[PDB]
Amino acid sequence: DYFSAANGEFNNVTILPLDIDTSISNEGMALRPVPVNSGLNGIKGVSPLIPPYFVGEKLNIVHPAPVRTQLISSLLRG
RNA sequence: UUAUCGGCGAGACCGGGAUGCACCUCCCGAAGGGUCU
Numbered sequence: 001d002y003f004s005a006a007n008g009e010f011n012n013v014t015i016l017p018l019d020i021d022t023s024i025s026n027e028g029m030a031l032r033p034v035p036v037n038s039g040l041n042g043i044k045g046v047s048p049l050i051p052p053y054f055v056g057e058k059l060n061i062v063h064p065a066p067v068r069t070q071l072i073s074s075l076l077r078g
Numbered sequence: 079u080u081a082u083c084g085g086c087g088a089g090a091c092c093g094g095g096a097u098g099c100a101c102c103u104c105c106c107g108a109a110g111g112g113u114c115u
Contacts, residue, residue: 001079001082002079003079003082004081004082004083008079033080045080046080048080051079052079052080053080053081055080055081
């Protein structure tokens, strides 16, 4: 709840171009909720694929670890 | 944004004492002079 609780306020939004599309897949590891049949491994769950994630039938999905950490230097490498 | 919603709050004196002072001469030398009812 960013709206109600003001959790996870952010600023200084910086966008940088990437070289490889790392939105859905990452060497076969899903980086976001994807259907089970997509062949991507990770953690099983139930959720709608498309937002908003509180409406729509909750179908089986594979999603990454809820808390993923990466070094900022590695993230800025691109 | 995996839901929907939620002020953390209320009260307090921090203050009470102290001399910083005690000793030193800054002086030593020179002509500013000469030209035009």
